[PDB]
Design a binder for these strands. Structure first.
Length: 276
DNA sequence: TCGACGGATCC
DNA sequence: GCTGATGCGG
DNA sequence: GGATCCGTCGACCGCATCAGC
C-alpha cells in the first residue's frame, strides 16, 4: 500500500513551538543527488541542520553548489581513509557547533567515513551511515562488531548530554518496518542479528525511535526503495533512516517526518522537529 | 524484488 | 574525455 | 502424474570507481 505522511506537528506535547529542524538524507551519491535537484529540495525545506549519508565524494571533489547554502554555512565532511567513491557523511549547520568529532574512537570502525559528532549547547547530534551486512551477508560478522562498538560509544555520549542520532542505520527494526519481511529474514538489514542489535541499542543507551514512538502502528512508512523492479512506485520499501532520541528529549519532540515525495536517491529524507 | 528454476509433496 | 569492467548497495 | 508448494538463485538500477588510453 502507498503511504501519505501526516502534516508537520510543530508544537511540543506542552505546546512549545519547535525551535530546531533537522533533516537527514542518505543521498547515495552527493554529486548525482545535486544534479537531481536535491539541494533545491533542501532549500525549500529550509532545515537548521542537514545530515547526509553515503556521499561517495571525497573532500577534494565536493561540488561548488555546497558553498552557496548560507543557512547551512558550517559544513563538516568525513570520507573513508583509503576507499574512494565509498560511504562518506556530511553535517551542515546554520549555527556553528561547539565541537565536532569524526568517528567513534575505535580504530577498526573509524576508517570508512561513517560518523560525525556535533555537540551543541543542549544536545549532541550524531549522524551515521551504518555498515551494510552485504550481499550474501559477507559483512554480517563485521556488522555485529560495529553494532556493539557503536552502542558502547553512544551510551558514553548520552551519559553526558542528551543525544540525537540520525542517519541510515541499515536495519528495519520490526516487520512493520518493511514491505516484505517474510522473504528478507536472511538478507542484509533484516537478519535477526541486525534486529537484535537495534533492539539492544534502543535499550542500552537508551534511545527511543522517534517516528515509531509517535506512529507506533502506522504501516508502509519507508525511507528506502531499491532502484530495481520499480519498487518505489509500488512502495515496496524499508524504513532504514531514523531519528533516535534520548528519552529526556521526548517531551521536546514535536514530530518525526518521512519526506516520501522528495526524489534524488534511493532513500527519501527524514525530518525532525524539536522544541529546545 | 522479482520470476524462474528445481525438488518435494498432496490430492 | 571515453570505453568497458568492477564494487557496492538493501 | 498434474498441480501446488517452498527454499534457492540470479538478474534488473544507479552511482562511482578502476584500468587503459
Amino acid at each position: 500500500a502507498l503511504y501519505e505522511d501526516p502534516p508537520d506537528q510543530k508544537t511540543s506535547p506542552s505546546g512549545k513551538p519547535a525551535t530546531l529542524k533537522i533533516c537527514s538524507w542518505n543521498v547515495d551519491g552527493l554529486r548525482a543527488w545535486i544534479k537531481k535537484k536535491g539541494l533545491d529540495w533542501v532549500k525549500e525545506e529550509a532545515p537548521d541542520i542537514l545530515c547526509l549519508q553515503q556521499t561517495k565524494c571525497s573532500e577534494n571533489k565536493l561540488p561548488a553548489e555546497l558553498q552557496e547554502l548560507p543557512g547551512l554555512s558550517h559544513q563538516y565532511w568525513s570520507a573513508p581513509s583509503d576507499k574512494e567513491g565509498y560511504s562518506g557523511v556530511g553535517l551542515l549547520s546554520r549555527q556553528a557547533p561547539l565541537k565536532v568529532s569524526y568517528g567513534i574512537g575505535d580504530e577498526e570502525h573509524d576508517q570508512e567515513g561513517r560518523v560525525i559528532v556535533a555537540e551543541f549547547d543542549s544536545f549532541v547530534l550524531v549522524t551515521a551511515y551504518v555498515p551494510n551486512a552485504g550481499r550474501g551477508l559477507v559483512r554480517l560478522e563485521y556488522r555485529q562488531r560495529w553494532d556493539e562498538a557503536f552502542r558502547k560509544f553512544l551510551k558514553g555520549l548520552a551519559s553526558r548530554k542528551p543525544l540525537v542520532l540520525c542517519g541510515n542505520l541499515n536495519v528495519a527494526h520490526e516487520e512493520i518496518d518493511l514491505r516484505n519481511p517474510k522473504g528478507n529474514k536472511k538478507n542484509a538489514g533484516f537478519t535477526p542479528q541486525e534486529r537484535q542489535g537495534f533492539g539492544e541499542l534502543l535499550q542500552a543507551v537508551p534511545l527511543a525511535d522517534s517516528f515509531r514512538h509517535l506512529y507506533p502502528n502506522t504501516p508502509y512508512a519507508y525511507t528506502f526503495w531499491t532502484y530495481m523492479m520499480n519498487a518505489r512506485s509500488k512502495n515496496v520499501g524499508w524504513r532504514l533512516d531514523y531519528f533516535l532520541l534520548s528519552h529526556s528529549l521526548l517531551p521536546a519532540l514535536c514530530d518525526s517526518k518521512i519526506r516520501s515525495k522528495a526524489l534524488g536517491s534511493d532513500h527519501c529524507p527524514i525530518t525532525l522537529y524539536l522544541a529546545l
